Structures are given as C-alpha cells and as structure tokens.
Design a protein around this ligand. Structure first.
Ligand SMILES: C1=C(c2c[nH]c3ccccc23)CCN(c2ncnc3[nH]ncc23)C1
Ligand SMILES: [Zn+2]
Length: 278
C-alpha cells in the first residue's frame, strides 16, 4: 500500500495554483532509494486517466497514483533533463538536424496520443521535457501550471497562447489537427528564435494568429519551409497530419528524410544534447 510517507521530499520542481511537483525518494519497498517526481493536486481526473492509458517512450510514465486527504498524488518518472525550452534558450536557434530530432520524437508521441483519442493542444517548449539521455518526454496533461488565471473558469488563455491553433482560441470546436499546428509553431520557434505569430499585447497576438499570415524566413531549407507551410494553416482539415495518416503524413515529409523511425523510437538515435554532460 502506497502513501505519502513512503516518499521523502528532496526539492520543489514546480508549483502552480492547482498543484505542486517534488523530486522525491522512495524509502520503502523494493524501489527503496528510487527517485521519482511527485505531483500533488488539491482536489485532475482526465490527467490521471490519460497517464494510466498511455505508454510510449516519449511520454512520461506514471508509476503510482493515490489519494489521501483531499490531495491526489501522482508518482511519475523523474526527468532530470529539464525543459526543451532551456536548450532552445541556451542555443538561441536550433540547427535543423537539432530541431528535426526533437520534432521527430514529438511527432511519434503525438501519433500515440491520437490513436488513443488524446489531444496535447500546447507544444510550447516549457511543456516538453527531456529525460536523462536527452530524449523527449511529453509531460503536460494537467489543468494549468500558472499562478494567475485568465478568466475565472476555463484555463486556455492562462499562459502563452503563442503555440495554440486558431480554432482553440476561437473555441469553435477542434480535433487532433490542433496538435500538428502546435508542432509547426514549435518548429518555427526552434528554427527562427521566436513563435510564428506574436503581438505587442494579448489582443494583437490573437489577431495575428487568427489572420495566420505566415512569414517564412528565406534562410531555412526548402524542406523546412514546405513543412511549416503545411502545418501552420488556418484551415485545420488541410494541415499535414490532419488527414487519415495522422503522424504518418508528417513523418513522411522530406524534412524528416534522414530519420530511421525504428531507431528513433528505440532511442538508439543520439540526442543532439546530453543533459548529463552539461
Ligand atoms: C515542471 C512541472 C511544473 C512546473 N510548474 C508546475 C505547476 C503545477 C504543476 C506542475 C508544474 C511539472 C513537470 N516537471 C517534471 N520534472 C521532472 N520530472 C518529471 N516527471 N513528470 C513531470 C516532471 C517539472
Ligand atoms: Zn489557469
């Protein structure tokens, strides 16, 4: 039987309005000494449900889950590699091979989610973690990681909306196509140093995202520009990935022509950055 006393708290990894995350050490049972991430939620139901259903090398693992008092406890694999964001922040702009690597792993995680009817919605780089090897882990399935909350009910607009598809901002209904939009916004951020549609304030950013007039920098390879054009489109249904092939359609793009998907998935491809060496 698992309970909070089975874990000593080592440090605060993050704290939001609705939850808090610790690095923890288990001190009982056969995983004695094992390090985990512990997320504590003040009761969140769809989050646990998703993690119990998903199982993929590029999606974070859920080890234990329990509730005691008013709190829900998720015990996740500890990811020492930090946020994808941190790497983008240090590098300024990714080389295309670099960007390619991460987008390729991500696209596989998204394939898995969609096959199970799950939508990630928001690929802002602080929502993508790296494991100790430097491989991608999607981690963000909870309510909202923010301190101050937009509106007073729903949590779409709370953090940056710079990677969110037009139809999400409009609340006009949406599907998995939004995730391929967000992949394009992430890809654009990686390659250019900023997301595709930014304003001076909130209102303007939304307006630029809705107008969706893409500026493709001339510096990028032909294959990169063509993929970005195919991802960042207002018409959700016409996005690469929006069709029957889902991730398949995206993975077959020339931009990924050097990817052995078998090797990538087995994590036998060397990540461009190794957190243990940094
Ligand atoms: C950052 C997180 C976070 C930051 N601010 C928050 C506010 C509310 C809820 C969560 C957060 C969450 C995930 N995270 C992780 N770090 C390391 N191993 C991890 N395994 N699984 C997740 C995880 C670090
Ligand atoms: Zn919020």
């Amino acid at each position: 039987k698992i309970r909070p006393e089975c874990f000593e708290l080592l440090r605060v990894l993050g704290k939001g309005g609705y939850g808090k995350v610790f690095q923890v050490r288990k001190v009982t049972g056969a995983n004695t000494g094992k390090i985990f991430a512990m997320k504590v939620l003040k009761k969140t139901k769809a989050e646990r449900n998703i993690l119990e259903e998903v199982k993929h090398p590029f999606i974070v693992d859920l080890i234990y889950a329990f509730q005691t008092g008013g709190k829900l406890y998720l015990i996740l694999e500890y990811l020492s590699g930090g946020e994808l964001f941190m790497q983008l922040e240090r590098e300024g702009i990714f080389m295309e091979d670099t960007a390619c690597f991460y987008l390729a792993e991500i696209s596989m995680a998204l394939g898995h989610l969609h096959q199970k009817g799950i939508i990630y919605r928001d690929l802002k780089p602080e929502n993508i973690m790296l494991n100790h090897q430097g491989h991608v882990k999607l981690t963000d399935f909870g309510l909202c990681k923010e301190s101050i909350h937009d509106g007073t009910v729903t949590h779409t607009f709370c953090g940056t909306i710079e990677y969110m598809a037009p139809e999400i901002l409009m609340r006009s209904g949406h599907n998995r196509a939004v995730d391929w939009w967000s992949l394009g916004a992430l890809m654009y951020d990686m390659l250019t140093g900023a997301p595709p549609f930014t304003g001076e304030n909130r209102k303007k950013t939304i307006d630029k995202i809705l107008k969706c007039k893409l500026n493709l920098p001339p510096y990028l390879t032909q294959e990169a520009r063509d993929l970005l054009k195919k991802l960042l489109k207002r018409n959700a249904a016409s996005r690469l990935g929006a069709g029957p092939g889902d991730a398949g359609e995206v993975q077959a793009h020339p931009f990924f022509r050097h990817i052995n998907w078998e090797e990538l998935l087995a994590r036998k491809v060397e990540p461009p950055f190794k957190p243990l060496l940094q």
